Amino acid sequence: MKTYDLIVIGTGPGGYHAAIRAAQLGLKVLAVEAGEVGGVCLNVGCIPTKALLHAAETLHHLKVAEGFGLKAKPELDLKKLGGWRDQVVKKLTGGVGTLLKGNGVELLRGFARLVGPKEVEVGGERYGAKSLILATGSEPLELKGFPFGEDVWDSTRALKVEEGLPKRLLVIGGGAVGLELGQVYRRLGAEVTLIEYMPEILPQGDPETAALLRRALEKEGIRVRTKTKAVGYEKKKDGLHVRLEPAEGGEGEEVVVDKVLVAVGRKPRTEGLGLEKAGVKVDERGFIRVNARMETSVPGVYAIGDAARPPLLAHKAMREGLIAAENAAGKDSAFDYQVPSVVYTSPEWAGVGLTEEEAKRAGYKVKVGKFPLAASGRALTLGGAEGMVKVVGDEETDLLLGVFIVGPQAGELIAEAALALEMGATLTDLALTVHPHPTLSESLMEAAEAFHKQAIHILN
Amino acid sequence: MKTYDLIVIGTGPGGYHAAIRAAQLGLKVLAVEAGEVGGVCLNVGCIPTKALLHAAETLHHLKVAEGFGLKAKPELDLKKLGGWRDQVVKKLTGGVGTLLKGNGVELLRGFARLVGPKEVEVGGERYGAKSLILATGSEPLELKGFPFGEDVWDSTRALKVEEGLPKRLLVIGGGAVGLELGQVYRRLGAEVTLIEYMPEILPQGDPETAALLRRALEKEGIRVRTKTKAVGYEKKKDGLHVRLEPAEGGEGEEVVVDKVLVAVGRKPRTEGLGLEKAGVKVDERGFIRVNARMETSVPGVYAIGDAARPPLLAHKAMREGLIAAENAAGKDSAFDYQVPSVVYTSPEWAGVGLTEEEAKRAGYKVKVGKFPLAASGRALTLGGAEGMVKVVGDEETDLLLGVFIVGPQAGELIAEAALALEMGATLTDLALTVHPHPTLSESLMEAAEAFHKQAIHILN
Numbered sequence: 001m002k003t004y005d006l007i008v009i010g011t012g013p014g015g016y017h018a019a020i021r022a023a024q025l026g027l028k029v030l031a032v033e034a035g036e037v038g039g040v041c042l043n044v045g046c047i048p049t050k051a052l053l054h055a056a057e058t059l060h061h062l063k064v065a066e067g068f069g070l071k072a073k074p075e076l077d078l079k080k081l082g083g084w085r086d087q088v089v090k091k092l093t094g095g096v097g098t099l100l101k102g103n104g105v106e107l108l109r110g111f112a113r114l115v116g117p118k119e120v121e122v123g124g125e126r127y128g129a130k131s132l133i134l135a136t137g138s139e140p141l142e143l144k145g146f147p148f149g150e151d152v153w154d155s156t157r158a159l160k161v162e163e164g165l166p167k168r169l170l171v172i173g174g175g176a177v178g179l180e181l182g183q184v185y186r187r188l189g190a191e192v193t194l195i196e197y198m199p200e201i202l203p204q205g206d207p208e209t210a211a212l213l214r215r216a217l218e219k220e221g222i223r224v225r226t227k228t229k230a231v232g233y234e235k236k237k238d239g240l241h242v243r244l245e246p247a248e249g250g251e252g253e254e255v256v257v258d259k260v261l262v263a264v265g266r267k268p269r270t271e272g273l274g275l276e277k278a279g280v281k282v283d284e285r286g287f288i289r290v291n292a293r294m295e296t297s298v299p300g301v302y303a304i305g306d307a308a309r310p311p312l313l314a315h316k317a318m319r320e321g322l323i324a325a326e327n328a329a330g331k332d333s334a335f336d337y338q339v340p341s342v343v344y345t346s347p348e349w350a351g352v353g354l355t356e357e358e359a360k361r362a363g364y365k366v367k368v369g370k371f372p373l374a375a376s377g378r379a380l381t382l383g384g385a386e387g388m389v390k391v392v393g394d395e396e397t398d399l400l401l402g403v404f405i406v407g408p409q410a411g412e413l414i415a416e417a418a419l420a421l422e423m424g425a426t427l428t429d430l431a432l433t434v435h436p437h438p439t440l441s442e443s444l445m446e447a448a449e450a451f452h453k454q455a456i457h458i459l460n
Numbered sequence: 461m462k463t464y465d466l467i468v469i470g471t472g473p474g475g476y477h478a479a480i481r482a483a484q485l486g487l488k489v490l491a492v493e494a495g496e497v498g499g500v501c502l503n504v505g506c507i508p509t510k511a512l513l514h515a516a517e518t519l520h521h522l523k524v525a526e527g528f529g530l531k532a533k534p535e536l537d538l539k540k541l542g543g544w545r546d547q548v549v550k551k552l553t554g555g556v557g558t559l560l561k562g563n564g565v566e567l568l569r570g571f572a573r574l575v576g577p578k579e580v581e582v583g584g585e586r587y588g589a590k591s592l593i594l595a596t597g598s599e600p601l602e603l604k605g606f607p608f609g610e611d612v613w614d615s616t617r618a619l620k621v622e623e624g625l626p627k628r629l630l631v632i633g634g635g636a637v638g639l640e641l642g643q644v645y646r647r648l649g650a651e652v653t654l655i656e657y658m659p660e661i662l663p664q665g666d667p668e669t670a671a672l673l674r675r676a677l678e679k680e681g682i683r684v685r686t687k688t689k690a691v692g693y694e695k696k697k698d699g700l701h702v703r704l705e706p707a708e709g710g711e712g713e714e715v716v717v718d719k720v721l722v723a724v725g726r727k728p729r730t731e732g733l734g735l736e737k738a739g740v741k742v743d744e745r746g747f748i749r750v751n752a753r754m755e756t757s758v759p760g761v762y763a764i765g766d767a768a769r770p771p772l773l774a775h776k777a778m779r780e781g782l783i784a785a786e787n788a789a790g791k792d793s794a795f796d797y798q799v800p801s802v803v804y805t806s807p808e809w810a811g812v813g814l815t816e817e818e819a820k821r822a823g824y825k826v827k828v829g830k831f832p833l834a835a836s837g838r839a840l841t842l843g844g845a846e847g848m849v850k851v852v853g854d855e856e857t858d859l860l861l862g863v864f865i866v867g868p869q870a871g872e873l874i875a876e877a878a879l880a881l882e883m884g885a886t887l888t889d890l891a892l893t894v895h896p897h898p899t900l901s902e903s904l905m906e907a908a909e910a911f912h913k914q915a916i917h918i919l920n
């Protein structure tokens with residue numbers, strides 16, 4: 001049995017961050033990976049999806065561009081697009097491999113399973129360490145009545161646009177994955193229908209900005225059906241006849257499509273991992289129970305990322321990996337941070353902090369400030385202003401509580417909001433910062449001014 | 461004589477901000493404008509230039525897009541482009557006019573001249589007020605040997621691309637104006653040579669990131685010559701023969717172009733304004749002398765924006781207008797803010813805070829963190845991925861001192877840095893904020909980690 005200071009199972013965002021940070025702190029690390037280095041985000045998630053979205057937005061904007069004299073007869077080669085997507089993925093996963101090697105981390109390819117609290121079995125061989133970090137991630141959640149197959153795709157299959165685009169696609173799930181892939185397919189020419197069980201898409205996010213995103217997608221032809229669920233389907237020669245019903249059940253309604261993309265969630269990869277042999281507690285949902293130090297019920301064993309707890313986001317997994325690594329190295333670290341969320345559709349949607357309802361539930365005297373991109377000079381110079389910024393704060397203390405953005409570059413602008421929350425910023429602090437003009441970032445400053453009823457570019 | 465609580469001369473960014481904020485505070489305001497409402501930024505500066513840059517970037521990106529299957533046969537109608545530029549300007553200036561009216565601000569069209577400390581003459585009529593706010597802005601600075609005319613353009617003329625593109629253009633000035641218009645013309649097909657008197661472009665900005673921008677421009681075919689000046693020219697049959705020399709004087713070198721764009725600076729519009737009749741002191745350069753409250757040598761008379769002092773930026777003028785208005789309303793406000801600066805070229809350049817040299821002179825123990833966009837996953841998904849983020853801080857206290865960025869969306873990312881500085885953030889604070897992945901904003905977080913020698917995506 002080979003021994004190390006730390007064994008990390010999984011090399012996705014969380015796992016490779018843990019391995020590298022642990023190595024920087026002087027630990028001898030072994031990283032085990034059953035598939036491609038880089039995990040879901042780099043191979044079949046964040047990266048390939050953002051790549052497709054960029055190509056789709058570039059194509060889409062050309063229609064807007066006709067407005068300023070740019071006439072074009074764009075021809076998109078899907079095979080070439082798929083090739084570029086693959087190249088981007090390869091460059092990034094290769095880069096992580098080079099990073100692991102350069103940091104002295106040993107990389108073992110195989111499926112790891114615990115056989116004890118501090119012993120892992122891989123390919124019949126045993127490996128041990130005083131610390132273990134479980135970063136096994138998640139997988140597409142299956143939906144009753146829609147088993148994955150040739151006609152029912154998961155997000156991974158949906159990425160392969162070069163394998164034939166369906167004329168009609170039904171997307172089940174109004175979360176980031178469904179919205180993003182849905183828009184990609186629409187912009188590539190497919191008829192797209194998206195259904196969401198909740199009253200509004202992005203159910204956990206601010207309903208107002210989420211609604212604006214839905215409206216933008218509807219304007220592009222995507223049929224969005226909220227408070228709706230898909231019960232099952234029947235395969236016929238003319239396509240898949242899917243039965244739709246109201247959220248709480250009711251009168252049936254049929255929709256016929258060629259393919260179905262199921263994006264209703266993720267399932268943590270914690271079964272068949274040997275956790276029951278190590279004493280690691282798992283909750284009813286399959287998530288490994290952890291505290292703020294990312295430590296499990298077993299001393300010296302940590303869990304991070306999608307396998308540990310929602311939200312299922314990459315930057316969160318990355319930070320959790322650093323925390324677990326630092327603690328495995330003997331430090332005293334803990335996760336207590338504001339986690340932003342972004343949807344990379346066009347316009348983008350981003351949020352961080354508390355929604356109006358959550359702030360109210362928390363006991364704050366909620367007050368909001370809004371700034372429409374229709375009043376943004378920068379948005380106009382970019383060919384059109386679609387979106388808004390909403391700031392949530394306490395009117396008594398002036399404390400900033402949350403920020404929600406819908407529009408171009410929302411994902412880049414939300415970092416300013418995250419920093420503001422981490423610094424305990426007030427709405428006055430946000431308004432007092434001199435944002436450059438003209439920029440989309442200015443909308444945050446103006447939304448803060450609107451909160452105080454003194455915005456300049458809009459009547460208060 | 462008609463009397464008001466406040467008279468604002470000029471309706472550019474500074475002027476209309478002062479007029480509106482004063483109105484919000486209950487003052488009876490009169491705003492005087494000799495030309496188009498909205499000033500330089502909205503009519504012949506920020507807005508039209510950013511619009512042209514966006515069109516040029518959309519066209520340019522098609523080359524990179526070919527890399528992912530996007531085939532196109534672009535055709536740019538310059539007349540249509542100019543028409544769009546005009547539409548954007550008209551919508552925004554019309555918007556400011558609507559805001560002034562909506563706020564109860566009286567708008568008088570004409571050229572105002574003070575005739576006394578608190579009295580202004582317009583069109584032969586007299587107007588008075590307890591407070592006066594001077595926001596007359598600036599105009600293109602003329603260069604010895606290059607009087608403006610048919611062959612020597614100022615930025616306003618350069619905006620009119622629909623009036624014929626020159627085969628060869630010489631741009632004098634390596635500031636934001638020269639760089640931006642130079643890139644617009646190059647992307648539109650012109651041969652472009654740009655010269656800068658100082659050793660590096662963007663002389664007051666971080667030289668490291670400024671040099672990367674220069675190199676990016678040179679890669680696009682723009683010939684950039686620093687430490688160089690233009691002495692004069694002679695109009696011949698084959699074009700304009702311009703004599704160049706080392707900035708400090710020396711052997712001459714001739715360059716032949718069809719048109720020259722002079723972008724060497726601005727001159728404050730303070731002559732013929734009646735300041736000598738009111739007792740308002742002006743410095744050697746023509747700027748109205750003001751303190752942090754934006755107060756001039758005459759109680760009750762304030763000056764803001766380009767007419768008051770450099771840097772000559774829109775967001776600065778806007779904030780100064782708010783300060784002046786608030787003080788005119790009886791409050792106690794003062795300008796003590798970090799002012800970011802942005803160049804909207806591709807890649808963009810942005811900076812805020814202290815450069816390494818300025819921090820060193822300030823007495824800080826300078827330490828820096830750098831992160832290359834070549835290591836950014838998001839940058840790769842957007843195609844080209846060139847640029848870098850540099851953070852400047854104090855080693856002993858960990859205090860963030862300055863941030864400089866060169867790359868896509870640099871101007872949108874700098875607001876986070878500005879907020880950080882206003883909040884007294886340390887490099888640790890910046891690194892601890894969980895930035896969304898994958899985003900370009902992550903580069904700031906990673907540059908902070910690099911400062912501490914523990915960045916994950918690059919070897920330290």
Ligand SMILES: Cc1cc2nc3c(=O)[nH]c(=O)nc-3n(C[C@H](O)[C@H](O)[C@H](O)COP(=O)(O)OP(=O)(O)OC[C@H]3O[C@@H](n4cnc5c(N)ncnc54)[C@H](O)[C@@H]3O)c2cc1C
Nearest residue numbers: 010012013014034039040041045112137305306312313314
């Ligand atoms: C289509 C799509 C788009 C997304 N877009 C975004 C986005 O834009 N932004 C964002 O923040 N998040 C996004 N996500 C979610 C993001 O991908 C995840 O939050 C992130 O990958 C979680 O990292 P992780 O390290 O926990 O796990 P994972 O990346 O899943 O990696 C776990 C790794 O462990 C390996 N592994 C598992 N079990 C074993 C075992 N027993 N032995 C050895 N190796 C094992 C796996 O093969 C894998 O490589 C997206 C997800 C999808 C599906």
Ligand SMILES: Cc1cc2nc3c(=O)[nH]c(=O)nc-3n(C[C@H](O)[C@H](O)[C@H](O)COP(=O)(O)OP(=O)(O)OC[C@H]3O[C@@H](n4cnc5c(N)ncnc54)[C@H](O)[C@@H]3O)c2cc1C
Nearest residue numbers: 470472473474494499500501505572597765766772773774
């Ligand atoms: C090509 C170009 C691009 C630029 N790009 C940017 C950029 O991207 N970002 C940025 O921050 N800055 C940019 N600037 C600079 C920015 O435009 C100025 O900083 C800003 O306009 C200054 O605002 P202001 O209110 O002080 O003055 P101005 O906007 O100049 O407005 C002054 C107003 O006063 C009027 N006026 C003057 N004298 C009188 C009088 N006696 N009576 C009545 N009315 C009078 C003028 O007609 C005018 O409308 C750019 C400038 C140029 C030339």
